[PDB]
Amino acid sequence: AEYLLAINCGSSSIKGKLFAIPSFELLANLAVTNISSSDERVKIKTTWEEGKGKDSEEEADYGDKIRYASLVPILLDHLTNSTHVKKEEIKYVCHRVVHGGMHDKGIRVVKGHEEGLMEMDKLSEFAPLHNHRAVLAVKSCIDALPHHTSLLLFDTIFHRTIAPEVYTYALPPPDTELTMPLRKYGFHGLSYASIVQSLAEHLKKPSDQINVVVAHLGSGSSSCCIKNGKSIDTSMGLTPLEGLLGGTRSGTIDPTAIFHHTEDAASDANVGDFTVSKAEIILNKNSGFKALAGTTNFGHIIQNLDPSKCSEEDHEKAKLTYAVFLDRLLNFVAQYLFKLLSEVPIESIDGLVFSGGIGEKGAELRRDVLKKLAWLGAEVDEEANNSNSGGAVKCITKEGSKLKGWVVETDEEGWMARMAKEEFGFLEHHH
């Protein structure tokens, strides 16, 4: 018996999937929730499929009393001394690490092997706001599972194809040798890759023939221009901060604004364990929907566009926040449609895809975007767009729409398992 665990470590939750090896058959969904909280207790839940395992929930300490480094081992204990799976049976663990710098492929991390471990530390150090936990979880696994191989899969990988004229930052050399160049990297690559593959299968054509604009919208939001199945531009830059605003992030603003906003902006924030500037905290954790609307929940913002569900003040903040998000989003959809349409006709593009937490649930947002593209021939299908009629790939435009619109469910952890299948040789058919 052998398993692959694929995990995705966020600030407020860890999501994971357990796969059977060498089958790569999905066995379980795992979730660790309430990670931040001082009030609610960390919950750990497993959810098998059909007949793979008996569900079981586990409540640990309040989130603020658990070190992040202890979560995965708690999760691992829960897996073993509550189900049929043994630690020594976990041969592989895939980790979503946001920032992979210049890496074209995932990195193996194996106990004792200095290279993978040192590279992982350099990535963690370069972008700790984004990679910290990502690296912490890996370190904990190395400790708890001494004989497994960890595979780091990066959200930057999908964007390694972007050309120099797109990624270049017009800056002089830095004052010191850095771990990686300062340039646009781009993120959400595991989602974009997954989306292209789902759409290609749905349309029954290879992914290298997919031409699409994707708006992957959630607590972090971005958009990507995909030509022949490959990223050619995306809205995020050196870090996930750039581009669209998010639950708590500002998105693109004048690079000098923060110096006005906050004194000693380059100084250490003295929050958390790792060193990070006050500027990076404010821009990533105190901005975005939180600063504009009082909530990080975009669905709550969409509700409050109805002035009967809130005070006049919250209705007005919701109106503004919604309009800002839509405006910034239309900007990128415009850039990316333009960039595709400059080379290929609208008939030859597979369309506009919405994904992410907001992309899947925000029917109003999708309708407003699609109305704005009426001049290009997009026509929303109001029922399809508004109904809960399923499918991981769902059309939301009318049959005669000259631009096709879709909602696509991402499966990042599933994608990581697919990458690991290739990585560990399970696709080799030599002679």
Add this chain to the structure above:
Amino acid sequence: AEYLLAINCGSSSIKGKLFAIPSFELLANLAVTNISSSDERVKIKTTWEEGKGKDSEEEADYGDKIRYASLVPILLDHLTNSTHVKKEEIKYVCHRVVHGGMHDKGIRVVKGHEEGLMEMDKLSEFAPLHNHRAVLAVKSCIDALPHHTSLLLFDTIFHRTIAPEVYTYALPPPDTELTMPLRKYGFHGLSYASIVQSLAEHLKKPSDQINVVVAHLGSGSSSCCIKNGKSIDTSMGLTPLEGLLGGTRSGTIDPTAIFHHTEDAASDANVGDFTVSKAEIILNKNSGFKALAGTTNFGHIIQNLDPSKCSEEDHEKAKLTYAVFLDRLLNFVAQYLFKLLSEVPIESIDGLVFSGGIGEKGAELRRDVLKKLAWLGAEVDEEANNSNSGGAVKCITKEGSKLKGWVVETDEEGWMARMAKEEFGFLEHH
């Protein structure tokens, strides 16, 4: 006799015009060129309209070596050397000031009046890299012309119509109360206002019927979406740094980039005579074309697209820099055309306007931009695109083009004079 002087202090050049009032007869052009250049000396040229004085031209030190604040006084000196102009006759001076914050109109500045001086100082200390040079020009005018009135006219005025959903930065309240909100302001407004009026006149229709996207391209470049004659969006944000990269400016990059790039980025750069962060210095003076191509001159970059004209390395840098600039420019042209087209048919937009130093000269750049717009039905007219026929407004697209393309020559000093007229109430009677 009374005159109005309109002065436009840039980092690359100073331009001015002297006008008789209330007639607004042009009497002199003033030009200081090569101000940022390392191998050409600053040239100071005064050119008189027929009858008013003797054209005068003079050379000063290299641009990278010159004391900027010495320039305006030399200009004033050239003006009063005419037998037709005395200092006492120069009653008004109009100044282009980049950042006017929330002001809806210009600010009068008079020697001995605390109101104007104070406000000018608040704007200069909010954005000294963009305003300090013009403010020094104002003090030079006060010193030399104790009885004149200065009027500061802001690049931000044209963009006061932009909607909250466009200008809002998703930031929390700042840590202190600031001079003005942190939001998108937008600049080159005197140029855009001038372009709209020029195009309106050429098309023989009111400025409020103008719907265009404008790419104002030069040392600092921006783009603007204009609907019914008004700015509804524009590429620069809180400062002219945001948006397109420029001669020495990075343009839009991840706001946290500079913190990786440079230690203690928020600290005083301690250079020149005003307080400015190392970050702001790096992003504005050491980035952009300078960093990528090793030159600030986009014309040299274009020339170097031909590999026979330069080294292999300079050819490679030029190709990249040119491609970077074109990619970023097309992003905003895309945003703004989409923004207009989302409400009006393409048949009723006046089109795409090129302006600015680079926009007027870069025939090949306009060609490359229009080629990317082929899918919309844009078609360049090679002969018209290279025409030097002359005229403030020229069409560069083919009769058949679904999207009209133009080159329009800005007259910022002339626009300032128009704004002064409305401010001070000059008009000749009968």
